[PDB]
Design a protein around this nucleic acid. Structure first.
Ligand SMILES: [Mg+2]
Ligand SMILES: [Mg+2]
Ligand SMILES: [Mg+2]
Ligand SMILES: [Mg+2]
Ligand SMILES: [Mg+2]
Ligand SMILES: [Mg+2]
Ligand SMILES: [Mg+2]
Ligand SMILES: [Mg+2]
Ligand SMILES: [Mg+2]
Ligand SMILES: [Mg+2]
Ligand SMILES: [Mg+2]
Ligand SMILES: [Mg+2]
Ligand SMILES: [Mg+2]
Ligand SMILES: [Mg+2]
Ligand SMILES: [Mg+2]
Ligand SMILES: [Mg+2]
Ligand SMILES: [Mg+2]
Ligand SMILES: [Mg+2]
Ligand SMILES: [Mg+2]
Ligand SMILES: [Mg+2]
Ligand SMILES: [Mg+2]
Ligand SMILES: [Mg+2]
Ligand SMILES: [Mg+2]
Ligand SMILES: [Mg+2]
Ligand SMILES: [Mg+2]
Ligand SMILES: [Mg+2]
Ligand SMILES: [Mg+2]
Ligand SMILES: [Mg+2]
Ligand SMILES: [Mg+2]
Ligand SMILES: [Mg+2]
Ligand SMILES: [Mg+2]
Ligand SMILES: [Mg+2]
Ligand SMILES: [Mg+2]
Ligand SMILES: [Mg+2]
Ligand SMILES: [Mg+2]
Ligand SMILES: [Zn+2]
Lengths: 49, 69, 65, 104, 97
RNA sequence: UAGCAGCCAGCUUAGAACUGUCGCGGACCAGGGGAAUCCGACUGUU
RNA sequence: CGCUCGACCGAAAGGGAGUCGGGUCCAGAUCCCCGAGCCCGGAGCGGCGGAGACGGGCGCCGCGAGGCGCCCAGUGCGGUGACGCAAACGAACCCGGAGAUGCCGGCGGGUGCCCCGGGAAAGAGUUCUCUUUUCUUUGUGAAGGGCAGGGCGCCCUGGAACGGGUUCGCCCCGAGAGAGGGGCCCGCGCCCUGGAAAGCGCCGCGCUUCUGGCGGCGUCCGGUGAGCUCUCGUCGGCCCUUGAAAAUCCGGGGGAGAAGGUGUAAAUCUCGCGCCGGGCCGUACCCAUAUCCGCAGCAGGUCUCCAAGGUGAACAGCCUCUGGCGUGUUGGAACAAGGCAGAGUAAGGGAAGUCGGCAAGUCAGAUCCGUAACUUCGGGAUAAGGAUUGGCUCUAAGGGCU
RNA sequence: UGAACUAUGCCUGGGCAGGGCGAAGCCAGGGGAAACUCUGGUGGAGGCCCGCCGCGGUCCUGACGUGCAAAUCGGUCGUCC
């Protein structure tokens, strides 16, 4: 909600920075071995609790 | 804000150490002298017209004046 | 509304609420009681009736007379 | 006619979430949160039902910034006892102390 | 009390004329619920060169003149060509869009 | 002095004439009723 | 110096000092900018001003305005009173107040909204005919000063039966009414400071990424109402229901103490103003027929605030303005059967249908009449059973003010 | 390991149009020799009545029944100081 605690807001900040797409240069570095981040979550499909 | 009614009291508050500036608002029927202080904005409503210039020059030197028109 | 002021559109077939709902009987009693008592207090002030006849008419007005 | 809303997070009609309508210089009608009404002091006698007179009716912590003359009267028990019960305490104290002289 | 009607721009372009617009007011000014004889001599209308002045002793709200001026333009199929605007107090000018 | 004059203000009630094709709570809103038997008194609850 | 002291946690709807007006963004806003305040904490000089500070009694200089010595005062003052004055010392300890009391009903004061009257001003709409017409806009914050208005078992004088005063209802009076004169409290209403410079409305000019700026005028005069809400009061009703604690704040009692010896001192509930500081955390958005839960953009579920015009008893139903939307996970062409629904309609008969009046059909508002058996006397009862209802033109009755 | 659903209790908050019958108390006018009675008005009582939101879920054994829904939808219906 709008009323958050510092620990909850610090927990939502990390999950927001983990949900970023894989960098483009990582794909060429690994030779298309890691093409997409296998931990991408959607705010409608997956809930973090 | 406080409203001063006597001319002597206005010149007494305008010479304080915390007098920032005095603003002159020329209305249709009167003319107000708004001296800015640390807490309040004192205002002397002068209904007379010729008594305004006799008080505008009576202001102490060094106090910034702003004629609002 | 200008026509209803003259009585139009307010017949028997244009009413759907009780007479006590269209005009509260408790408020008609409150109006009249404030009109009579105000008249009795003006006659006593103007010395048209004494305080003894005022108190009799006051109780007679409190009853539906 | 405009339908105005609250101005704070509290969206319930609690005892502290009380508002009133004020007309702003911008020709608007907005809510203006009012403080709870104060109560004048009562007499220490516990008999007279009416409140005390000559004393402001504000909140408790508002009495910290008021002057003393705005919180009592110039009588003996002013601010804590009504005038009618003070003059009875004076007569009761004098008459009881007089019967204790007759016994000696 | 005293109101004027400035229509110099429309008569300069040759659209209307103050001669006909003046006669239109004499038959459509409603005084005391009637439009005949202007209620007698209380309401006097004067027509200068492309400038009509209306004077009377009753209040005679000025926006009634704008009500009849626009009523005159619509009658002459030029309502979408002029715009009755109050330039100054006690006045009413006719301008284009 | 069995009170009058001036001015202002609404909203209701009652009666009457006339009138339409006897239609008028014209849409909407809005209890079918009566005589009896069994069980539980009633309101409430599951 | 300390018994009420037994740590501490526990409310983003309880208690809880103090922020409001205008503007600004692609998204922020009582937080930013501008303007105007406020509260709390801080001071051996706490920085000034004012209060505490009012002087008397004996001799002389003296025919004087005043000046010389001693002695004695002075921790404010006014009012019969309620109580009022800018301040107006005061410990331990004690007492009390506020915080801090339910639900319901009636009435009154004030705002907001709605409505009415200006043959009001500024734009717009309509004009085939009529329409001085129709629609929109007409403003003031917190804080302080003043005044309406409301409330008061508050004071003084006085004295009551032919009892009087008084409410919609009540209630009140020799434990002292009515009347006359005062005091206090609430004032969120009005005027003023704020404050029009700003905000809206209209008009004109300049300008097209400094341009995205400058000017003019206006912001008016009243009315009430069984109107609707909110709020402040006030009088009641109900209970074998009595409808919270604490932080915190204040007053009084108390007179332990401190202050100086003739002009000041102690002390000041800012007492007029000035000086400094206010850290940490949350703050975007959705809040629900697509941002929550139900495996989903699920006809389900999920706590609240604001809430207009007409008809009407209504926050019912139907229609409209502000605001919102494209008909709710798709378009097109047909109108067969059979379904779901419109509670579609129907000749004559009217429950013969069926386990069964299932289904839906009749009745329905309101006014005026008229209402049995039975009963715990409360009821039954809108019993049952009749009449009236539109539109239009009039008449009669029900008010206020001078 | 669970009372985020539900059952009961406690603390602290919020909410419940418009109408109807109309009890005690009170005023007035009549009857009385007293006991005490009658009419009108007032008043606004109630696990009272019609009824909106709310809260419930009767009947159609309707719709739906590989549904919108692992219990929902429509009319009707109970209650609403
Ligand atoms: Mg979800
Ligand atoms: Mg009644
Ligand atoms: Mg409410
Ligand atoms: Mg039997
Ligand atoms: Mg049987
Ligand atoms: Mg039963
Ligand atoms: Mg705690
Ligand atoms: Mg709170
Ligand atoms: Mg926003
Ligand atoms: Mg301070
Ligand atoms: Mg002195
Ligand atoms: Mg002094
Ligand atoms: Mg001094
Ligand atoms: Mg409380
Ligand atoms: Mg409470
Ligand atoms: Mg009340
Ligand atoms: Mg008296
Ligand atoms: Mg003391
Ligand atoms: Mg937000
Ligand atoms: Mg959808
Ligand atoms: Mg078919
Ligand atoms: Mg069918
Ligand atoms: Mg048939
Ligand atoms: Mg058969
Ligand atoms: Mg059969
Ligand atoms: Mg049936
Ligand atoms: Mg029966
Ligand atoms: Mg409650
Ligand atoms: Mg019944
Ligand atoms: Mg219901
Ligand atoms: Mg329901
Ligand atoms: Mg259940
Ligand atoms: Mg159902
Ligand atoms: Mg079924
Ligand atoms: Mg099927
Ligand atoms: Zn007392």
């Amino acid at each position: 909600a709008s009323h958050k605690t510092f620990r909850i807001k610090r927990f939502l900040a990390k999950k927001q920075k983990q949900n970023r797409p894989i960098p483009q240069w990582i794909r060429m570095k690994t030779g298309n071995k890691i093409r997409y981040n296998s931990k991408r979550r959607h705010w409608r499909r997956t809930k973090l609790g | 804000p406080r409203k001063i009614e006597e001319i002597k009291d206005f010149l007494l508050t305008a010479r304080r150490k915390d007098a920032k500036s005095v603003k002159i608002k020329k209305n249709k029927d009167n003319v107000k002298f708004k001296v800015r202080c640390s807490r309040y904005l004192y205002t002397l409503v002068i209904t007379d017209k010729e008594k305004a210039e006799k008080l505008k020059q009576s202001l102490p030197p060094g106090l910034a004046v702003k004629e609002l028109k | 509304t200008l026509a209803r002021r003259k009585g139009r559109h307010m017949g028997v077939g244009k009413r759907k609420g009780t007479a006590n709902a269209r005009m509260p009987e408790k408020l008609c009693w409150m109006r009249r009681m404030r009109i009579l008592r105000r008249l009795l207090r003006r006659y006593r002030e103007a010395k048209k009736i004494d305080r003894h006849m005022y108190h009799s008419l006051y109780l007679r007005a409190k009853g539906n007379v | 006619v405009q339908r105005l809303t609250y101005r704070r997070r509290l969206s319930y009609n609690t005892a502290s979430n009380k508002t009133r309508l004020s007309r702003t210089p911008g020709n608007r009608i907005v809510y203006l949160y009012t403080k709870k009404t104060g109560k004048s002091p009562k007499s220490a006698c516990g008999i007279c039902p009416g409140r005390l007179r000559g004393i402001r009716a504000v909140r408790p912590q508002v009495l910290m910034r008021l002057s003393k003359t705005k919180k009592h009267v110039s009588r003996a028990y002013g601010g804590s006892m009504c005038a009618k019960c003070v003059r009875d305490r004076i007569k009761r104290a004098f008459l009881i102390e007089e019967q204790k002289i007759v016994v000696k | 009390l005293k109101f004027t009607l400035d229509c110099t721009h429309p008569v300069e372009d040759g659209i209307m004329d103050a001669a006909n617009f003046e006669q239109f007011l004499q038959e459509r000014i409603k005084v005391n619920g009637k439009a005949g004889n202007l209620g007698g001599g209380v309401v006097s209308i004067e027509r200068s060169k492309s400038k009509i002045t209306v004077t009377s002793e009753v209040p005679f709200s000025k926006r009634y003149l704008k009500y009849l001026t626009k009523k005159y333009l619509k009658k002459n199929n030029l309502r979408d060509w002029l715009r009755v605007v109050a330039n100054t107090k006690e006045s009413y000018e006719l301008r284009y869009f």
